[PDB]
């Protein structure tokens, strides 16, 4: 689809079998989701944003479907203010900025 | 143009007579720029992201040029680690997400 930006670009995603709402976030290198339960191994990591750094759990090679488009990549889980889909997955679904 | 997301979507902007680099950021409601001494009145504001909140100064009706596309709107100035162009200005230059 073509998505305008008068509203937040929120979309439904599927991860671990469960549906969620997430923000398409071209300013995020990485995908960060709010606290949730995910199967498989993970490693502790740090990520920094506008206000400082937080502790996250890094899940690699996770299946996630974004607005009907499949991706498999890294998903960080931790105290982000909102679920964000970052460039690591936006590239996988073929997302570009256009003006 | 069309901007892929393999790397950060950085572009040149012109604001307050200065050229700078800024992110085209669909996850940013507002536009936040590095500390710069703009003239005129302002109001304090707090904006939150990963890591918490930062204090910024809100200037209204600021002229910004983004890749030759002119816009005018609110700009927040503060100790942000990165300049981000938010949706308030991305809509004005006709920017969409597409996949
Ligand atoms: C609430 C949704 C986002 C937080 C997730 C909000 N951010 C915009 C993001 O695009 C920032 C924009 C950003 C980009 C680099 C550095 C600081 C901020 N990116 C970000 O935080 O990404 C992190 C996850 O991937 C990593 O790659 C970059 C940092 C990491 S933000 O910078 O904090 C921001 C910008 C304008 C705003 C605002 C919050 O409140 C209203 O106006």
Swiss-Prot record, chains A, B:
Active site: 25 (for protease activity)
Domain Peptidase A2: 20-89
Ranges for region Dimerization of protease: 1-5, 49-55, 88-99
Domain of life: Viruses
Residue ranges of the TM segments: none
Assembly notes: Homodimer, whose active site consists of two apposed aspartic acid residues.
Protein name per UniProt: Protease
């Amino acid at each position: 689809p073509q998505i305008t930006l008068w509203k937040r670009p929120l979309v439904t995603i599927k991860i671990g079998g469960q549906l969620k709402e997430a923000l398409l976030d071209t300013g995020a290198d990485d995908t960060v989701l709010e606290e949730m339960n995910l199967p498989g191994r993970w490693k502790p990591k740090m990520i920094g944003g506008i206000g400082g750094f937080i502790k996250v759990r890094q899940y690699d090679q996770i299946l996630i479907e974004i607005c009907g488009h499949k991706a498999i990549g890294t998903v960080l889980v931790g105290p982000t203010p909102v679920n964000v889909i970052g460039r690591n997955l936006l590239t996988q679904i073929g997302c570009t900025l256009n003006f």
